């Protein structure tokens, strides 16, 4: 139940109003970002946005996308700084109405390189194309440190795998998740590494409709089926142990009947203890005969 109750109607309960990622990160910037964006852009060079809106889900295709979404959310906030005194003043300004959040600060400049030559081109779409971005260089300045387009993204057991077992030559990595709920990153010769995503409605992903858990139908129905079979086998085992209990209760009844019959028989015993005996004539007659 807890596997799904966190999003049972909350995704439906948006009050028919746009739920901006500004407060989806946590409750308290939405009242202060409108007034603090100018302050961020004032000192030093103008501050780049937290990249929450710059990178967003496109066409609602997040099954393959979440693996790279987690990697880019590992370092998503990018604010530009050049003066440590200005950095401390920026920290003080950020602590205006309370943040209660961890905001990475990134002043890495734009990078200029081509990123299509490295990949292999195939029918299955590239994972990055699933995401939506404004400027390629914004993501590329993080791609250089850890290339994300090169890796081969597949399911747990399919083709075009074990490249790391095959070792990379003129390529770098072929890691990928194994499961949609929690996919261990593919590693041939290395231990797989899990990745955990976050689910939120920051865009109008309900533009077509706002019905209750259309995407969650399969998960909840499979969970109900699992509960059904688990409770059925549990009912079978409790039924058989209860039948055994009924049998032992029946033989308890048999033992109680036996002991009560023994009680009747001892009542008979002292009935026949208290009876007259007529052997006096027999003994006297035997003496007379002798």
């Amino acid at each position: 139940s807890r596997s799904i109750q966190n999003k049972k109607v909350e995704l439906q309960n948006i009050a028919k109003g746009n739920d901006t990622f500004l407060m989806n990160f946590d409750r308290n910037m939405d009242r202060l970002l409108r007034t603090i964006e100018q302050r961020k852009n004032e000192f030093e060079t103008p501050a780049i946005g937290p990249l929450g809106s710059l990178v967003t889900i496109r066409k609602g295709f997040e099954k393959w996308t979440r693996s790279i979404q987690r990697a880019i959310s590992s370092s998503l906030n990018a604010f530009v700084v050049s003066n440590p005194k200005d950095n401390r003043l920026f920290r003080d300004i950020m602590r205006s109405c309370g943040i209660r959040s961890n905001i990475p600060i990134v002043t890495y400049c734009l990078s200029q390189f081509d990123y299509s030559k490295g990949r292999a081109h195939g029918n299955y779409p590239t994972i990055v194309d699933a995401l939506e971005f404004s400027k390629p260089e914004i993501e590329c300045l993080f791609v250089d440190l850890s290339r994300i387009e090169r890796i081969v993204l597949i399911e747990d057991k399919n083709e075009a795998r074990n490249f790391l077992q095959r070792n990379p030559v003129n390529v770098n990595m072929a890691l990928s998740l194994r499961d949609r709920r929690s996919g261990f990153q593919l590693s041939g010769g290395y231990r797989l590494d899990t990745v955990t995503y976050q689910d939120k409605i920051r865009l109008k992903v309900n533009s077509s409709s706002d019905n209750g858990t259309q995407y969650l139908k399969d998960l909840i129905e499979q969970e109900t089926k699992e509960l059904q079979n688990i409770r059925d086998r549990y009912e079978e085992k409790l039924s058989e142990v209860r039948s055994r209990l009924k049998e032992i209760d029946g033989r308890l009844k048999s033992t109680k009947n036996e002991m009560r019959k023994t009680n009747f028989r001892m009542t008979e015993l002292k009935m026949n203890v208290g009876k007259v005996v007529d052997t006096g004539i027999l003994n006297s007659k035997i003496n007379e005969r002798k």
Partner: protein
């Protein structure tokens, strides 16, 4: 069970890791080089050091089983590979020589590096030295500012790249170069939060399982009272007995 238990119960996957360690321990098997999570052996003097060590290595890397020598990598977790979900860490070679072994070029006396306040298992120590490089991470408990970071941001004579990762207080500064940019360092600042992992304290003292202990001893008192009721019932049974022998 001074061994860390309740902290590991906070995550279902980490509970699977607990179970894996459990049937590793139950069967003695052949343990050439035993494996234990670094979250377990690492003891931090305070929660601040716990946050430092939880940030120095990755959270997923924290929930991994160390391997000191790459020669034996799969030879340990052969059967439980598919039984439950686990994680491991690979080690090849690193330096344990700490900086500032002497008077050197400075007379500040501003504390030391990350290698001073860590104590634990040999495999865990080597794992954290290999993965986090505690020797190259300096921590000063007083008078540390990003201004000193920028006065050092100029290529030190030790190397053009300044450092790789610095942690201090509630801040983490990473030193990086622009490969296709202007070849100018762009340090990255990340706020950190207090973490209960790697901490010397026994689980979380604030709430722990104490209320469960209180309800458990309340149920214990109730069971004792029920036992007294059963004893009185037994006394009544003995009285019915002596009644039976009087009738006999």
């Amino acid at each position: 069970t001074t061994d860390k238990i309740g902290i590991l119960n906070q995550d279902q996957d980490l509970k699977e890791v607990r179970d894996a360690v459990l049937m590793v321990r139950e069967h003695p098997e052949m343990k050439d080089k035993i494996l234990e999570p670094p979250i377990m052996t690492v003891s931090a003097i305070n929660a601040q050091f716990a946050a430092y060590l939880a940030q120095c290595v990755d959270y997923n890397t924290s929930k991994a089983l160390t391997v000191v020598d790459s020669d034996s990598y799969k030879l340990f977790a052969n059967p439980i590979l598919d039984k439950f979900k686990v994680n491991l860490r690979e080690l090849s070679s690193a330096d344990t020589t700490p900086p500032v072994p002497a008077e050197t070029v400075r007379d500040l006396g501003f504390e030391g590096y990350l290698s001073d306040f860590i104590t634990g298992d040999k495999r865990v120590m080597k794992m954290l030295c290999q993965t986090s490089k505690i020797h190259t991470i300096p921590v000063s408990r007083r008078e540390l500012t990003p201004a000193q970071i920028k006065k050092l941001i100029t290529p030190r004579p030790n190397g053009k790249i300044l450092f790789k990762r610095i942690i201090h207080g509630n801040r983490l500064v990473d030193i990086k170069q622009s490969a296709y940019g202007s070849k100018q360092v762009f340090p990255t600042d990340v706020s950190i939060k207090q973490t209960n992992f790697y901490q010397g304290s026994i689980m979380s003292n604030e709430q722990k399982i104490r209320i469960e202990n209180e309800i458990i001893n309340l149920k214990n008192e109730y069971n004792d009272r029920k036992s007294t009721l059963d004893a009185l019932s037994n006394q009544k049974s003995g009285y019915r007995h002596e009644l039976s022998e009087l009738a006999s």
